[PDB]
Design a protein around this ligand. Structure first.
Ligand SMILES: CC(C)=CCC/C(C)=C/COP(=O)(O)OP(=O)(O)O
Length: 129
């Protein structure tokens, strides 16, 4: 088995967080995520992932936590971020991997969540300052 590093992004706007419907974890709601590429910082990865998935330009990317996820095994580094221009909205650029993006309140997250995300929600994870 291989151990892989993913970066998972909590993109916040006000009291809302961006979630998408995955198309591993089919038809569950998840945060933007993807594989750290060699040479990247966590922050570069976060930005790249959001740009590839939604065309959104993010900033003020800050480390929150890290979790271990056995399935392969994923070490998932959770970052928070804001939009560089909060007037922008997500566009579903990769329909092969996602059915759509939306803004949700942490006190009313959609279900079902991708299980690695549910795991941290169960543990009291909250990305909002
Ligand atoms: C909070 C989360 C999601 C923790 C788990 C991290 C994880 C398995 C990401 C998968 O990356 P991906 O979106 O590129 O899918 P895949 O591994 O199938 O390529």
């Amino acid at each position: 088995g291989s151990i892989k590093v993913a970066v998972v992004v909590c993109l916040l706007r006000g009291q809302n967080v961006l979630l998408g419907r995955r198309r591993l974890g089919d038809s569950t709601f998840s945060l933007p995520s993807g594989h750290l590429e060699f040479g990247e910082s966590f922050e570069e990865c976060a930005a790249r992932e959001l740009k590839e998935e939604t065309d959104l330009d993010i900033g003020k990317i800050e480390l929150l936590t890290v979790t271990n996820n056995l399935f392969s095994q994923y070490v998932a580094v959770f970052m928070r971020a804001v939009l560089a221009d909060p007037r922008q909205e997500p566009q579903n650029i990769e329909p092969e991997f996602c059915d759509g993006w939306g803004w949700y309140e942490w006190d009313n997250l959609p279900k079902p969540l991708f299980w690695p995300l549910d795991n941290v929600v169960q543990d009291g994870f909250n990305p909002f300052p």
